[PDB]
Chains A and B, each alone.
Chain A
């Protein structure tokens, strides 16, 4: 599959618009992304904002500015001519049912499949909660793609200036287990379709991990053997330094 990369310039741009647009009472701020989707790795080097207002009790009322789309063409094209509109982004933690109708408005300006980017403004997740989706023909479905961080001279300089293993993964595995656990509890309470089909894929593919235990410990002892021959070398860098430090002490006594 393809890849999606979001620069920290786009990250901080979407996260700052929360307090800039006075977004509260669980609302969203619809932006726009600028990148090159022609390659296999989608990289967004520019982003902007758009005014968005939606009623809480009415999902059929939403405001969008299509005039600002033509305003960035008179600006960005005079600086970077390789910037095009590959889609938009949202500041909400989870998508709603209105995103299906938003794709009809941007399909004329975008020259390719629009990209759906979701950025969590609450920062309540672990790692990179920012996710991306690609709308294709199912009627329509959203194909998720992994999100990475852009590494370039135009970003890491500003990141290092403002700012300056398994234990982290343990908290990440709990998020995947509790997500499926709470989904079953909410399902049984509201009743007594794609999740039920893919749910048993994990159960039939951790009692099954105990059959290879005989072959698992075969390569585990090699790790300790590699550490045993390395442990002897560890003393070679120590005792040798003790001999050198002893010769330094003999010169300090004569002083």
Chain B
């Protein structure tokens, strides 16, 4: 489970196994977060030389 070979989850109370593994979605978080970091450095060069 922690090695990320097969995503799953156990139950140690009753001795069972539930559903865990689910896929991801692109163009939402990972794609948008990388754009925020790039646009933050570009805007810093705008007002710097504007004054």
Contact = CB atoms under 8 A, between A and B. Distances in A.
Interface residues of B, number: 11
B32 A232 contact: no
Given A229-B35, A232-B39, A233-B39, A239 B28 contact: no
Given A243-B49, A246-B50, A225 B42 contact: no
A153 interface: no
A74 B46 CA distance: 74
Nearest to B35: A229
A222 interface: yes
A180 B49 CA distance: 66
A240 B49 CA distance: 11
A25 to B, nearest CB: 62
Contacts of B49: 243
Contacts of A242: 50
A189 interface: no
B36 to A, nearest CB: 8
A65 to B, nearest CB: 64
Contact of B39 (A222, A226, A236): A236
Interface in A221-255: 222, 225-226, 229, 232-233, 236, 239-240, 242-243, 246
Contacts, number: 22
B20 to A, nearest CB: 21
B46 A243 contact: yes
B17 interface: no
Interface string A207-226: 00000000000000010011
A240 B28 CA distance: 27
Contacts of B42: 236
Contact of B50 (A229, A233, A243): A243
Contact of B32 (A229, A233, A243, A246): A229
Interface in B3-49: 27-28, 32, 35-36, 39, 42-43, 46, 49
Given A225-B32, A229-B32, A232-B39, A239 B27 contact: no
A12 B24 CA distance: 55
Given A222-B27, A232-B39, A233-B39, A239 B32 contact: no
Interface of A: 222, 225-226, 229, 232-233, 236, 239-240, 242-243, 246
18 contacts: A222-B27, A222-B28, A225-B28, A226-B27, A229-B32, A229-B35, A232-B39, A233-B39, A236-B39, A236-B43, A239-B43, A239-B50, A240-B46, A242-B50, A243-B46, A243-B49, A243-B50, A246-B50
Give 6 closest A-B pairs by Cβ, nearest first.
A243-B50, A239-B46, A229-B32, A229-B35, A232-B39, A243-B46
